[PDB]
Amino acid sequence: PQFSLWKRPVVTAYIEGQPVEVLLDTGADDSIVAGIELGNNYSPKIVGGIGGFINTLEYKNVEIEVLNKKVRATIMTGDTPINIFGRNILTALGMSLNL
Amino acid sequence: PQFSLWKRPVVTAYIEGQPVEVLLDTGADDSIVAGIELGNNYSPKIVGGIGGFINTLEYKNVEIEVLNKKVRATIMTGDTPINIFGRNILTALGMSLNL
């Protein structure tokens, strides 16, 4: 599909079966989502946002379903004011920025 | 043209003559950059993102030069840790995000 960027490129994803709304971010290197609990392994971690730092948890080998595609990705969880899917999952789906 | 998101989508930009390296961010509604001085014709703004807020000076109708194109868009200066070009500028260049 094609996202015209005239409005926020939002969409539905299922993190291990759980539906959440996310904004596709081409400037971020990683992925952060709030409101999710998982059984995969993890390790604590601090991320730097545009405004400052927040505390997160990082899970690995997390199965994600987006745009009818399934991938095994690494994702962070914490109290973010906006859910985002960064480049790490975008490249695995074959997405590109055209002009 | 087209970027594969395997590498951070960074380009060189020419804002009113002054060169800046910027990141193309589809998750950002606006454009904020640091180091560029554009005059005594500005309006104070505050913007929020992950980790907090940033105080900016909004300048309208600034002349930009990126990807062999000349546009006139709105830029915000402030203390950002990374220079961003958001949806307002990406729509003006006609860029899209495809899967």
Ligand SMILES: CC[C@@H](c1ccccc1)c1c(O)c2c(oc1=O)CCCCC2
């Ligand atoms: C929330 C969306 C966005 C943003 C940009 C400008 C103003 C307000 C909000 C945003 C990003 O795209 C990234 C980070 O943090 C952010 O807040 C983290 C690090 C930098 C790149 C990605």
